[PDB]
Amino acid sequence: MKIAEIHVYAHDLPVKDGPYTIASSTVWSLQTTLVKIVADSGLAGWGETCPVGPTYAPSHALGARAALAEMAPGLIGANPLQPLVLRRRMDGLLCGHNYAKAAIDIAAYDLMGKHYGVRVADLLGGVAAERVPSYYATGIGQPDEIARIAAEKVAEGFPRLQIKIGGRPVEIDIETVRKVWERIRGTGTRLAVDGNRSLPSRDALRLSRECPEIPFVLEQPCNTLEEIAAIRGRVQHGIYLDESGEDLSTVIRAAGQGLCDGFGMKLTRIGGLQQMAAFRDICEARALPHSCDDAWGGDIIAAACTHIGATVQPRLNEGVWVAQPYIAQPYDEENGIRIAGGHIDLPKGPGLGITPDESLFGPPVASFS
Amino acid sequence: MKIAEIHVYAHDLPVKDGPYTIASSTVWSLQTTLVKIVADSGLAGWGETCPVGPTYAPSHALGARAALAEMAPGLIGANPLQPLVLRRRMDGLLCGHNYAKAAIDIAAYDLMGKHYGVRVADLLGGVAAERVPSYYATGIGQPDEIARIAAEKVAEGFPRLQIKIGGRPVEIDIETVRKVWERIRGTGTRLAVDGNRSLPSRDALRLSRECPEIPFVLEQPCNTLEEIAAIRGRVQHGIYLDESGEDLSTVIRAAGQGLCDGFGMKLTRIGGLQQMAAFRDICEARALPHSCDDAWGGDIIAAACTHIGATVQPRLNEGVWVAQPYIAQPYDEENGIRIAGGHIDLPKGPGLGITPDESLFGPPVASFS
Amino acid sequence: MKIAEIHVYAHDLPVKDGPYTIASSTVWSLQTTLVKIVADSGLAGWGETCPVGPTYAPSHALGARAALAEMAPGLIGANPLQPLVLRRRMDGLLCGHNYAKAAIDIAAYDLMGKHYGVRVADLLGGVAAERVPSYYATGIGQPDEIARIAAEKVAEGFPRLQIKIGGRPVEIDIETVRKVWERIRGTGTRLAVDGNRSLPSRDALRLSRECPEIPFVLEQPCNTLEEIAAIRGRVQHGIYLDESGEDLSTVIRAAGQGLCDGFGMKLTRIGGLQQMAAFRDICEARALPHSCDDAWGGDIIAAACTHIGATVQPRLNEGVWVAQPYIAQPYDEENGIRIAGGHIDLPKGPGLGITPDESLFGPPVASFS
Amino acid sequence: MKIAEIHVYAHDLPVKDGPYTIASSTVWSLQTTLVKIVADSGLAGWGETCPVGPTYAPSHALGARAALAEMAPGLIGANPLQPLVLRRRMDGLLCGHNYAKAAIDIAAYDLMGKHYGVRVADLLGGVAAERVPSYYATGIGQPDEIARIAAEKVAEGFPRLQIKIGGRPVEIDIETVRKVWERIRGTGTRLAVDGNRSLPSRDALRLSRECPEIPFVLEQPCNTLEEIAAIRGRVQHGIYLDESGEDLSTVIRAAGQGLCDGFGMKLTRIGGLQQMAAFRDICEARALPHSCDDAWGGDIIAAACTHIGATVQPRLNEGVWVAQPYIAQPYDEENGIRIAGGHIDLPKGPGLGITPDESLFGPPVASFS
Ligand SMILES: C[N+]1(C)CCC[C@H]1C(=O)O
Ligand SMILES: C[N+]1(C)CCC[C@H]1C(=O)O
Ligand SMILES: C[N+]1(C)CCC[C@H]1C(=O)O
Ligand SMILES: C[N+]1(C)CCC[C@H]1C(=O)O
Ligand SMILES: [Mg+2]
Ligand SMILES: [Mg+2]
Ligand SMILES: [Mg+2]
Ligand SMILES: [Mg+2]
Ligand SMILES: [Mg+2]
Ligand SMILES: [Mg+2]
Ligand SMILES: [Mg+2]
Ligand SMILES: [Mg+2]
Ligand SMILES: [Mg+2]
Ligand SMILES: [Mg+2]
């Protein structure tokens, strides 16, 4: 089988009741990029990449489309049923840009699943769970307000909460953490506190030192892995990497040298499902819990995250985060990804189990044949 | 789909022109263990595990059969199309015993390939090369005799040689290395020198120190990874791990802490194809060349090694070693694995591409349903 | 003063006597991106960024233009005479993408120099030398052909040569190094050998071990800084970082932990002149020799590299590499950067000292006001 | 342009309501040294260096004047518009003595700013803030007395307090810290506790161990960087370096090896504004908060500190400390540096924005032409 066509789409995603405030990025609307790969036979697979604002990570919508434009001509004729060979071919056309490569990777897995009549999770090792936990991530806000939302989302069924902090005096972050804990203690809910690269080591040290009785993991408190490695021995809370986990090589360093206790991992950042599966296997060998998330996006990226999420050993699964609650219009009205009771059901159909309504996207902004 | 039956077989393989002498194991004949998994549909898949004598590694033929007998009843009804789920189910029945688990893993991949109409290499990421390099491993012997054999094997087309050493005064090993190099220098042939756990650090240091102009990698010179880690900074030849690479966790330590420059990796030791693919991905991220080998065995294990080997980035592929030259009777005379010109052509059919003449194996020593 | 307009240009530069072969990138023509910043006063400054093919580094021409388009609207009204404030403003609009940010940075320095009537080198600490050394980088090729070219370039007056290697059996690289040394020994010519991320540690170890009598520095032998850190203690030749030196934070790690002995540093990679000056100061504090280069490009980027190069302590200056010998048409035929006798004379006028014939560039692909 | 004359002045600064008590130095009056550089054109720039007693650091007033006398003849004819070239010229005349070199560096930046018509901050990267935070540093005193002063200075508007400790039993220091915290908790005021090289590791360990709920950073608790590195892993409060930060090389060690969480940095110690800017850039890359201070002195050194302070990323700016509150007579009655509301306004004029009344200083004690 061979790739005959590649189509790139641009589509807007307004944030319901926005904005969503991360210490590194405040977003009111998101520009997603969809990719459709069409085989010689006419069979199609879909991929998606949607950076969460241009300042969260070294990625942006215009950049995704430029990277896809660079690679697409060189991918016509490739075998989409060989995800590792396909990844190497992409590497031969463009260095880096994992967030764009991931959209091609995902579309190829979708296509492969449809061709063989198999769910993507069953091409990645097998479904370990049909119902996948999610987690709720609060935007930065006022301490009492965030504590209220925390309680609300626990009641909805989320087994884990992530509280975003930073970009303001750390005593306000600490007050927020204490107030959230007062609401959720005794509910069996797991807690993560995400600094999103924004805390100097001075403040990360203080946050952990002041709160030994509060069982958070501290997610990406500082900007660089170098800073995190420097503070780790002085911090008695588990530390998770997120933004620092840019590639498999960095994951190997972190796990092999004992630099973290877990990960928030984004599928587009690591470069797609082929790489994400290897990441999963590394974490399982070292009992490092992790999530399977992305920055943002609709049914296509959400389904990809859910499929890899469904393969994770349940005791290590910190959840699959999706943007669905903030997105008004699903691409697949029948079988799109939906959070229910703080969890996500894996789609039943072959491939990703998603069939997007292309008419929602408008005509492609770029087509390659 | 579900596993309906599991059949375990004992089969003998005497060494042509034996014995084969490893510093840790001398063998005149080998006892292999075959596994047949039968689905409800009637479709079957094959696996194999064959320790190279009982002293090379913590594994033996009677042990392989004991481990399989322990796990088999608990695997009836499992979905054979989910290799990671299947591995976890095995872990729930028996701790360790990767060499036995690998036989089930391989049979599952064979079954998956047959069911979907796909080659096993394509289920593991894709065929990067239809023909893979092999390497010739010499036995321990007289320096000039080993040098003659080395020259002969280069003339046959082997792109790499592994010279076994140890178990005698190291000056004889050094003379062997020097005489081999005299005959193969300028042929572009790669060289490995394998101590097979037998050299005290005293002698590993001496071998490297005396021969800076000879471009070998030093494979498993010392018994423990601890000894290797202690000598590495004082040894200017690349060092490869073989026997020490017992699981993915150990590979993560070695790669993440920079304890070696490559691997001789055995499929059964790491626990099968699911784990081997993860191993491959770790090595590729860090440009660590490796082989895809096993201890011994016929067409089934050989085909499994060849399939994973066919997925490796060619610049990192140190070869696929197979016991075929020492085995009188192939399981599959039409499609069985054969070395030609120091290389191995990947089988072209679905699954492993191997159809063993099951009659050769005798009745099962144990059957489960 | 305020930015009134920003104009982005696409322009082609085919390689004379191409292609130019790097182990990580082979190129027959280059697409450069020019930026013109216009102040309210009407005064203009120029910047440039030109990746050397899309596979050398995580940067490409379409990406440079996407990044500039993303940032430009948010820069209208900014004070162009404040390079650090301007860099922070860019960081607030787009994460990463140093190669694109560098073009804005360079245009700002050009504008500042023109406004104050000062050469850019004097804004960066002062002209230490009116004429700076360059170095010649050979392509990958036959050992004796590369040796001939090396001899020719020494006769032209180049004080340093960089021999590119990798992407083939290392014995050929070693033969190349030996044949080059045979021809240039005793001429006082400095030697670097650049693996361009392509050597497994196995081969980097071998190259150094075999050639202690040849005084090269080994530049970016391996792909990751992690691999380089692992081999450094076993390699007795100085090791320089190039591609790994992605930002000032990484330079701080490398200098502070003693991970390298020098740098091949590219202005666009580090993010522009503001960051490059800090880099220079770090290297001077630790006596780490370095070059001031870029990936490719015409008079604008070349002049920027020459200006920072002119500020470096002469004993630490490994040279300024420019693409001029491979470029048919200069932007400025009166003052453009040219190699003469293996060295480069700094332009004498204010700003970068370059007045590009803007007509050459075509209409802007994007304009902002 | 060229230096035509250098004039060195001696001037006394009585401590208002003295003495000021540091654990390493008690001072009743300070001897400052002013430097005037006059260009061929007649244009002048001013610098200043004022050690805070002869025992605080390896520097003293008689030593400043001796160092300037050594260097001045060798600086006549130099280009004062090239601060890095000028620094190298000074290094070629005298090793070390940064505190004296800094006065020349500052005078040259002043001159450069006047010549180009630009504020010194805009020659160092640009004004990031017109109003710069300061911090108040209490001398050593009785616990209740210091707590009262702490409350008073918070009310005046200082966003940060530094409490000096040491030279007495540590339980008194701990009582002081607790009493200060009781007064300032809930005011959003940041806290530093400065041991000024005086605590044995025994007592630094105790101070941190006993007070996890008090959010100080521990500034230079021990005498040597070696002692600080030894205790750092056992101390859960952020540790800042001050006296140990003697040069850029030491800063590179501290940041690269993760030996501290921030700095109190003195402009004269680091060697002037050229070096201070590089220091600032290193800290910004690693999110290490820092102050921009000096040991003591009037309008000239204060303005230099304010100018570099105005370029610091606001979230990393721990403040600019100046001696103004303790100095009765400003050099520039109109535009001298004044603390107002715990903050300092950047002068508006070119150069440092300061014009000293030379008649206050008396005739030069040494003149060079
Ligand atoms: C909550 N998230 C999964 C969504 C956007 C950022 C990310 C995180 O930083 O964890
Ligand atoms: C060469 N071999 C693959 C064959 C058996 C042992 C093994 C080795 O020690 O490398
Ligand atoms: C020689 N160069 C400056 C030119 C392009 C790549 C580069 C280098 O790798 O060093
Ligand atoms: C408070 N100070 C800025 C002024 C003199 C000493 C110094 C300090 O040690 O932090
Ligand atoms: Mg719950
Ligand atoms: Mg996160
Ligand atoms: Mg077509
Ligand atoms: Mg050959
Ligand atoms: Mg071996
Ligand atoms: Mg010469
Ligand atoms: Mg290079
Ligand atoms: Mg206040
Ligand atoms: Mg201090
Ligand atoms: Mg004179």
Domains and CATH numbers, chain B: 1-117+352-365 (3.30.390.10), 118-351 (3.20.20.120)
Q: Dihedral through CA A187, CA A192, CA A193, CA A194, nearest 10?
A: -150
Q: Are A209 and A174 in contact (CB under 8 A)?
A: no
Closest C-alpha to D119, from D353, D278, D354: D353
Ligand 2: lining residues by beta carbon, under 6 Å: B 22, 52, 137, 162, 194, 196, 242, 264, 293, 295, 321
User: Resolution of the coordinates in A?
Assistant: 1.6
A266 min Cα distance to partner chain D (Å): 24
Instruction: For residue B212, give the nearest of C209, C223, C227 by CB distance.
Output: C209
D366-368 β-sheet, strand order: D44-49, D29-39, D3-14, D366-368
DSSP annotation string for C94-136: -SS-HHHHHHHHHHHHHHHHHHHT-BHHHHTT--S-SEEE--E
Is residue A40 helix, strand or coil?
coil
Burial class (CB in 10 A: 0-12, 13-18, 19+), D47: buried
Q: Dihedral through CA D312, CA D314, CA D318, CA D319, nearest 10?
A: 70
CA–CA gap between residue D272 and residue D109 (Å, rounded): 10
Longest dimension (CA), chain A: 62
- ∠ Cα C239 C244 C249 (to 5°): 110
Q: Give the HSE-up count for residue D265: Cα atoms under 13 Å, Cβ half-sphere.
A: 36
C144 touches chain B (CB under 8 A): no
Closest C-alpha to D53, from D79, D74, D76, D26: D26
Q: Are D308 and D278 in contact (CB under 8 A)?
A: no
Is residue C266 helix, strand or coil?
strand
Query: Per the structure block, which two tokens stand in for D88?
Result: 């190298």
CA–CA gap between residue C349 and residue C352 (Å, rounded): 7
Probe residue for ligand 1, chosen from A59, A162, A222 as the CB with the greatest number of ligand atoms within 8 Å: A162
Residues of A with Cβ-Cβ distance to B311 under 8 angstroms = 84
| Cβ A255 under 6 angstroms from ligand 1 | no
CA–CA gap between residue B125 and residue B310 (Å, rounded): 10
Burial class (CB in 10 A: 0-12, 13-18, 19+), D27: buried
CA–CA gap between residue B128 and residue B148 (Å, rounded): 34
Place of tokens 């490398």: C254
Say how many C-beta atoms besides its own lie within 10 A of residue C340's C-beta. Answer: 11
Which bin fits C52, alpha (ψ -120 to 50), beta or left (φ > 0)?
Answer: beta
Mark yes or no for CB contact D278/C282 under 8 Å.
yes
SS3 letters for chain B? CCEEEEEEEEEEEECCCCCEEECCEEECEEEEEEEEEEECCCCEEEEEECCCCCCCCCCCHHHHHHHHHHHHHHHCCCCCCCHHHHHHHHHCCCCCCHHHHHHHHHHHHHHHHHHHCCEHHHHCCCCCCCEEECCEEECCCCHHHHHHHHHHHHHHCCCEEEEECCCCCHHHHHHHHHHHHHHHCCCCCEEEEECCCCCCHHHHHHHHHHCCCCCEEEECCCCCHHHHHHHHHHCCCCEEECCCCCCHHHHHHHHHCCCCCEEEEEHHHHCCHHHHHHHHHHHHHCCCCEEEECCCCCHHHHHHHHHHHCCCCHHHEEECCCCHHHCCCCCCCCCCCCEECCEEECCCCCECCCCCCHHHHCCCCEEEC
CA–CA gap between residue C192 and residue C181 (Å, rounded): 11
Instruction: For residue A60, give the nearest of C24, C60, C94 by CB distance.
Output: C94
Q: Which ligand is nearest to the CA of C153?
A: 10
Q: If you count them, how many residues does chain D have?
A: 369
C253 touches chain D (CB under 8 A): yes
Q: Is the peptide bond preceding residue D19 cis, with omega within 30 degrees of 0?
A: yes
CA–CA gap between residue B100 and residue B89 (Å, rounded): 14
Distances in Å between the Cα of D322 and the Cα atoms of C111, D110, D303, D349 are 35, 18, 9, 19
Q: Which ligand is nearest to the CA of B158?
A: 8
| Cβ D196 under 6 angstroms from ligand 4 | yes
Nearest atom (ligand 1) to Cα of A192: 10
Query: Per the structure block, which two tokens stand in for A30?
Result: 């998101």
Is residue C60 helix, strand or coil?
coil
Give the contacts of B215 (CB within 8 A, at least 6 positions apart): B190, B191, B237, C171, C206, C210
- What residues sit around ligand 11, an ion, with C-beta below 5 angstroms? C 194, 219, 242, 264
CA–CA gap between residue C222 and residue B289 (Å, rounded): 13
CA–CA gap between residue A24 and residue A196 (Å, rounded): 6
C320 touches chain A (CB under 8 A): no
CA–CA gap between residue D80 and residue D86 (Å, rounded): 7
CA–CA gap between residue A221 and residue A57 (Å, rounded): 15
CA–CA gap between residue D66 and residue C358 (Å, rounded): 56
Which bin fits D117, alpha (ψ -120 to 50), beta or left (φ > 0)?
Answer: left
Say how many C-beta atoms besides its own lie within 10 A of residue D260's C-beta. Answer: 29
| Cβ A295 under 6 angstroms from ligand 1 | yes
Q: Give the amino acid at A210.
A: E
CA–CA gap between residue D213 and residue D235 (Å, rounded): 13
Q: Are D10 and D65 in contact (CB under 8 A)?
A: yes
Q: Are A223 and A55 in contact (CB under 8 A)?
A: no
Place of tokens 């050594």: D70
Q: Are B99 and B59 in contact (CB under 8 A)?
A: yes
A220 min Cα distance to partner chain D (Å): 14
- DSSP label at D272? S
Mark yes or no for CB contact A55/C92 under 8 Å.
yes
Closest C-alpha to C107, from C53, C39, C32: C39
Give the contacts of C29 (CB within 8 A, at least 6 positions apart): C12, C13, C14, C15, C18
CA–CA gap between residue D215 and residue D211 (Å, rounded): 8
CA–CA gap between residue A45 and residue A4 (Å, rounded): 12
Q: Dihedral through CA B1, CA B3, CA B4, CA B5, nearest 10?
A: 150
Q: Are D253 and D286 in contact (CB under 8 A)?
A: no
Q: Are D244 and D232 in contact (CB under 8 A)?
A: no
Place of tokens 């014939």: C357
D124 min Cα distance to partner chain C (Å): 8
CA–CA gap between residue B316 and residue C278 (Å, rounded): 38
Query: Per the structure block, which two tokens stand in for C127?
Result: 């002209």
Strands C216-219 and D20-22: unpaired
- ∠ Cα A342 A348 A351 (to 5°): 110
DSSP-assigned beta bridge partners for residue D45:
D37
Say how many C-beta atoms besides its own lie within 10 A of residue D182's C-beta. Answer: 12
Say how many C-beta atoms besides its own lie within 10 A of residue C143's C-beta. Answer: 16
Distances in Å between the Cα of B72 and the Cα atoms of B48, B367, C57, C59 are 15, 9, 51, 53
C12 touches chain B (CB under 8 A): no
C250 touches chain D (CB under 8 A): no
Mark yes or no for CB contact C206/B238 under 8 Å.
yes
Strands C290-293 and C262-266: parallel
Query: Per the structure block, which two tokens stand in for C287?
Result: 């006596």
- DSSP label at D334? T
Instruction: For residue A281, give the nearest of B79, B127, B248 by CB distance.
Output: B248
DSSP annotation string for D208-234: HHH-TTS-EEEES-SSSHHHHHHHGGG
Which residue does chain C place closest to D116, by CA atoms? C116
CA–CA gap between residue C189 and residue C151 (Å, rounded): 10
Closest C-alpha to A131, from A297, A364, A338, A366: A338
Closest residue CA from atom 5 of ligand 4: D295
| Cβ D303 under 6 angstroms from ligand 4 | no
Q: Dihedral through CA C167, CA C172, CA C176, CA C179, nearest 10?
A: 180
Query: Per the structure block, which two tokens stand in for C239?
Result: 């090791």
Instruction: For residue A205, give the nearest of D261, D286, D287 by CB distance.
Output: D261
Mark yes or no for CB contact B188/C169 under 8 Å.
yes
CA–CA gap between residue A126 and residue A307 (Å, rounded): 9
- ∠ Cα C94 C96 C98 (to 5°): 105
CA–CA gap between residue C53 and residue C48 (Å, rounded): 15
CA–CA gap between residue C133 and residue A8 (Å, rounded): 47
Q: If you count them, how many residues does chain B have?
A: 369
CA–CA gap between residue B224 and residue B244 (Å, rounded): 7
B317-319 β-sheet, strand order: B136-138, B160-164, B190-194, B216-219, B239-241, B262-266, B290-293, B317-319
A131-133 β-sheet, strand order: A131-133, A343-345, A339-340
C66 touches chain A (CB under 8 A): yes
DSSP annotation string for D51-98: -SSTTSSS--HHHHHHHHHHHGGGGTT--TT-HHHHHHHHHTT-SS-H
Q: Are A55 and C94 in contact (CB under 8 A)?
A: yes
Q: Are C240 and C263 in contact (CB under 8 A)?
A: yes
Distances in Å between the Cα of A314 and the Cα atoms of A129, A311, C196 are 7, 8, 42
Q: Are A116 and B118 in contact (CB under 8 A)?
A: yes
CA–CA gap between residue B216 and residue B48 (Å, rounded): 32
